């Protein structure tokens, strides 16, 4: 038999599953009205995908080389990791460790320069929040989603990274609009109500240093005088599921879907995405702050019956 | 404690913490369909719109102005001997889940049984003339573009006072314009579950003897099986809660739908309704279009239970 808890996530999975709840990334070649929207995206928390919807004049045209161009070989922030892998599970000395990258600051030039050369380690550009720029995306064409957050962006992020910087899976607590401005981005999706199904661990924190020597290595996170930190994250690699060690995971359904140049994703709240790109891929992001309601709630009360 | 209980109380705690559908938010003019999407369809959150509607049926829809429109033509009425129709009452030391007695009556008679506070209790109840012409149900379209579909279920109601109807959930969206007199209703949010005792109830109906006494007859299926219903086992108007001490934890919103006025009542609110006498109602059920939220509730039921 089954334990009170099983039989109730059983009842939960397959619920979802007759009724096609988050089954599928709705496809449209014409961007909705505000209203549609709302109704269809927003309020069933259902990610949806439009073609060509932007005609931004970023799109075609950005590129690092017209970036340097366009504003000079100025120093920008960028993350490094050895694998590939920046926020993602990497071992050391036998040990597993969650592992944020190394943050700099190099000259965008010597950036192209990194970025063409993968005998070297994996690099990206991130901006979080341009007079030369600003004119080249019009964030209103965005209305017809931010009309159902009725709110700001929390965040805007600009990234520019190479094919093998991979985004291990995660949730996030906004609502997210994203905008792929050059080549493509690969997400792999797994809707919040398929948490049972994805298995979650406790790791030490550490973050990617370089020797005196030059070679990477994972440093231990601590708190002033205190202990290691540790950090909850997906073990699962959608790309290569080990279901010998997480057979809970073959229940889940994951989405995959590629976003193009011009392209718009929105990706609701607290769905768990994983994500690759092609080399040199340009693109922007808006974060909303959720708009918290029952679901919510019981999605913590899933966590509380999977931990 | 279990698993179970535990998962619960974080539930409710998150819940309490977002005092999630801690009030009937109040309008004093339509919202958008837009607003209405966004801020009450999509949060599964009750409003009140405080004279929304001018219908011409606001203010003249009366019984008599009734009988004169229909001719006194033969309605059918529900009839109970306690006033709760679709209630719990006991009979012969149990307890039963009770249907109304269902017959057909002239509409003068039924205004006459109205006016006898000592008769039994009856309410028309009538669900899909000169009579169109008093409404403008596009008025609704601010609340309908969110269910895009037309109503599913279209119900008049005239009532007495003394008829009360049981706490329960339905699975729809339900759009409910008061037209003549006022409603009183209690609410409580899907997520408070656990909060509301429910028991197993043998199924019974009102029927009257040739010399017209009230009983409760058992029903049974196409065998000679006795036919059973799940009901809500707590009165909100005055909870035993030594019987029911987690009903404690709910926390029940009170609100008073006037004539003009409209309420938004989401799917699986618990809601137990009240009305002044000869109350006059009509209301709009939407199925459900069902997401993440209604699996979760699937869910929670498995849990309680
Ligand atoms: O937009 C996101 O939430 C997201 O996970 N973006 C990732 C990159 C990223 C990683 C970490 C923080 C922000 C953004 C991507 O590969 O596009
Ligand atoms: O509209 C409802 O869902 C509802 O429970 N209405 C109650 C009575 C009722 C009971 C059953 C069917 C329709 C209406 C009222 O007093 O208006
Ligand atoms: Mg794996
Ligand atoms: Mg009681
Ligand atoms: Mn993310
Ligand atoms: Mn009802």
Same mark, same amino acid.
């Given at each position: 038999?089954?334990?009170?808890?099983? +039989?109730?996530?059983?009842?939960?999975?397959?619920?979802?599953?007759?009724?096609?709840?988050?089954?599928?990334?709705?496809? !449209?070649?014409?961007?909705?009205?505000?209203? &549609?929207?709302?109704?269809?995206?927003?309020?069933?928390?259902?990610?949806?995908?439009?073609?060509?919807?932007?005609?931004?004049?970023?799109?075609?045209?950005? /590129?690092?080389?017209?970036?340097?161009?366009?504003?000079?070989?100025?120093?920008?922030?960028?993350?490094? /990791?050895?694998?590939?892998?920046?926020?993602?599970?990497?071992?050391?000395?036998?040990?597993?460790?969650?592992?944020?990258?190394?943050?700099?600051?190099?000259?965008?030039?010597?950036?192209?320069?990194?970025?063409?050369?993968?005998?070297?380690?994996?690099? *990206?550009?991130?901006?979080?929040?341009?007079? &030369? !720029?600003?004119?080249?995306?019009?964030?209103?064409?965005?209305?017809?989603?931010?009309?159902?957050?009725?709110?700001?962006?929390?965040?805007?992020?600009?990234? !520019?990274?190479?094919? +093998?910087?991979?985004?291990?899976?995660?949730?996030?607590? *906004?609502?997210?609009?994203?905008?792929?401005?050059?080549?493509?981005?690969?997400?792999?999706?797994?809707?919040?109500?398929?948490?049972?199904?994805?298995?979650?661990?406790? *790791?030490? /924190?550490?973050?990617?240093?370089?020797?005196?020597?030059?070679?990477?290595?994972?440093?231990?996170?601590?708190?002033?005088?205190?202990?290691?930190?540790?950090?909850?994250?997906?073990?699962?690699?959608?790309?290569?599921?080990? !279901?010998?060690?997480?057979?809970?995971?073959?229940?889940?359904?994951?989405?995959?879907? +590629?976003?193009?140049?011009?392209?718009?994703?929105?990706?609701?709240? *607290?769905?768990?995405?994983?994500?690759?790109?092609?080399?040199?891929?340009?693109?922007?992001?808006?974060?909303?702050?959720?708009?918290?309601?029952?679901?919510?709630?019981?999605? +913590?009360?899933?966590?509380?019956?999977?931990?």
């Amino acid at each position: 038999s089954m334990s009170e808890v099983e +039989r109730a996530l059983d009842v939960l999975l397959q619920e979802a599953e007759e009724l096609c709840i988050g089954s599928s990334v709705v496809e !449209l070649d014409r961007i909705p009205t505000a209203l &549609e929207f709302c109704r269809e995206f927003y309020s069933k928390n259902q990610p949806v995908v439009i073609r060509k919807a932007l005609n931004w004049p970023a799109i075609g045209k950005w /590129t690092p080389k017209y970036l340097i161009e366009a504003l000079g070989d100025r120093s920008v922030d960028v993350a490094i /990791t050895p694998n590939g892998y920046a926020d993602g599970l990497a071992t050391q000395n036998g040990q597993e460790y969650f592992v944020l990258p190394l943050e700099t600051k190099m000259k965008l030039s010597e950036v192209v320069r990194r970025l063409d050369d993968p005998t070297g380690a994996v690099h *990206y550009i991130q901006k979080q929040n341009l007079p &030369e !720029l600003a004119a080249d995306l019009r964030v209103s064409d965005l209305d017809f989603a931010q009309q159902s957050f009725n709110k700001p962006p929390d965040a805007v992020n600009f990234w !520019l990274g190479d094919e +093998r910087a991979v985004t291990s899976m995660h949730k996030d607590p *906004y609502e997210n609009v994203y905008c792929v401005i050059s080549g493509h981005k690969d997400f792999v999706l797994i809707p919040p109500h398929q948490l049972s199904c994805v298995p979650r661990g406790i *790791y030490p /924190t550490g973050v990617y240093k370089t020797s005196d020597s030059g070679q990477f290595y994972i440093e231990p996170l601590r708190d002033e005088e205190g202990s290691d930190q540790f950090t909850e994250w997906v073990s699962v690699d959608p790309l290569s599921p080990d !279901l010998a060690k997480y057979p809970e995971y073959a229940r889940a359904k994951p989405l995959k879907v +590629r976003v193009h140049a011009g392209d718009i994703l929105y990706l609701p709240n *607290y769905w768990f995405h994983h994500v690759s790109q092609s080399h040199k891929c340009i693109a922007v992001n808006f974060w909303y702050d959720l708009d918290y309601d029952s679901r919510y709630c019981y999605y +913590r009360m899933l966590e509380q019956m999977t931990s």
